[PDB]
């Protein structure tokens, strides 16, 4: 079950590939430079992202990291509504 | 994770430590891990600082560290 964007509706089903596509989409959405290094900061899947605190996002992306955290939480929240 | 592994990570053998890491690489879809950097028993694995893990697993060391720390908390809770 995928969303409009090609990404599975439940973030917990995200592979590393999905995580990277989500990061690229977030960069485009937020007007951040689309770079190969952004996804390299997140070599993991959705299960791993669930364990990440805001602090761990900011550590990787100080400029924009909170929007990533915020967006992932929203996706996870609605998903848990199962 | 594997039921063969003892609940308290601090009691893991070297091979238990490797099983845990291999399981983590799969479960979290991490890039190939350099196991030469993790030839140690549970006692020492559990003493690695977040920065230590970071050096041995760039990009996901902090996640692994937190998971391990959580397993310890859990062995008690």
Query: In the 8-state DSSP scheme, what is residue B3?
Result: T
Separation of alpha carbons B66 and B59, rounded Å: 13
Separation of alpha carbons B1 and B14, rounded Å: 17
Write the CATH number for A14: 1.10.150.50
Give chain A's domain count: 1
Separation of alpha carbons B37 and B57, rounded Å: 9
Q: Which of B29, B62, B66 sits opposite A45 (nearest CB)?
A: B29
- The range of the structural domain enclosing residue B22 comes to 1-77
Separation of alpha carbons A72 and A37, rounded Å: 19
Beta bridge partners of A2: A8
Query: Residue A48 and residue B66: Cβ atoms within 8 Å?
Result: no
Give chain B's domain count: 1
Write the CATH number for B44: 1.10.150.50
Mutate to test the interface with A, among B29, B33, B59 (most CBs of A within 10 A): B29
Separation of alpha carbons B77 and B75, rounded Å: 6
CB of B35 closer than 8 Å to CB of B61: no
Query: Residue B59 and residue A15: Cβ atoms within 8 Å?
Result: no
Any CB–CB contact under 8 A between B29 and chain A?
A: yes
Q: Considering just the CA atoms, what is the radius of gyration of chain A in Å? A: 12
CB of A6 closer than 8 Å to CB of A25: no
Experimental structure resolution, Å:
2.1
- The range of the structural domain enclosing residue A63 comes to 1-82
Separation of alpha carbons B66 and A7, rounded Å: 27
Residues of B in contact with A45 (CB under 8 A): 28-29
Q: How many CB atoms lie within 10 A of CB A30?
A: 12
Beta bridge partners of A8: A2
Q: In the structure encoding, which two tokens stand for residue A23, read together?
A: 């990061």
Separation of alpha carbons B18 and A12, rounded Å: 25
Query: Residue B27 and residue A41: Cβ atoms within 8 Å?
Result: no
Separation of alpha carbons B71 and B63, rounded Å: 12
All residues at 6 or more sequence positions from A49 whose CB lies less than 8 Å from its CB, including other chains: A11, A14, A19, A42, A72
Of B40, B67, B68, B65, the closest CA to residue B55 belongs to B65
């Amino acid at each position: 079950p995928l969303g409009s964007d090609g990404l599975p509706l439940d973030p917990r089903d995200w592979t590393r590939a999905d995580v990277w596509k989500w990061l690229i989409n977030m960069a485009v959405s937020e007007g951040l430079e689309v770079t190969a290094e952004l996804p390299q900061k997140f070599p993991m899947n959705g299960k791993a992202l669930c364990l990440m605190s805001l602090d761990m996002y900011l550590c990787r992306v100080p400029v924009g990291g909170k929007m990533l955290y915020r967006d992932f939480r929203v996706r996870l929240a609605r998903a848990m509504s199962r | 994770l594997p039921p063969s592994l003892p609940s308290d990570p601090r009691l893991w053998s070297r091979e238990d430590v490797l099983v845990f890491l291999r399981f983590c690489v799969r479960e979290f879809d991490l890039p190939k891990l350099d196991f030469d950097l993790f030839q140690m028993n549970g006692k020492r694995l559990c003493l690695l600082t977040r920065a230590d893990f970071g050096h041995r697993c760039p990009g996901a060391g902090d996640v692994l560290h937190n998971v391990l720390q959580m397993l310890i908390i859990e062995s008690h809770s």
